Design a protein that fits this description.
part of a larger assembly, 2 chains, little secondary structure, about 0% strand, globular
Chain lengths: ~50, ~50
């Protein structure tokens, strides 16, 4: 959902640059983080392959 | 004189796979955990190479 109960970690800002240890609400990993054009209804906040 | 097609497959998709990206690409603790198996990084990748 819109992520409600968070942790004390400070929030940085995104970069389009490759290979960033992204942590969008407990979703760790890495990768190129380029913005794209996807629809994303407001009741869906996490798209999959 | 009847000419006749005869279709013969000669090759398939030259599919490789990164074994370490398939098993666990982002985690390095899992890559540490996968390391104590055999040479499945090598031999599994060398077999379909």
């Amino acid at each position: 959902a819109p992520a409600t109960v968070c942790g004390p970690k400070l929030s940085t800002d995104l970069i389009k640059n490759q290979c960033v240890n992204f942590n969008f609400n407990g979703l760790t990993g890495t990768g190129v983080l380029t913005p794209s054009s996807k629809r994303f209804q407001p009741f869906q906040q996490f798209g999959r392959d | 004189i009847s000419i006749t097609t005869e279709v013969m497959p000669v090759s398939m998709a030259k599919t490789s796979v990164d074994c370490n990206m398939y098993i666990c690409g982002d985690s390095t603790e899992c890559a540490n955990l996968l390391l104590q198996y055999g040479s499945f990084c090598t031999q599994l990748n060398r077999a379909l190479s």
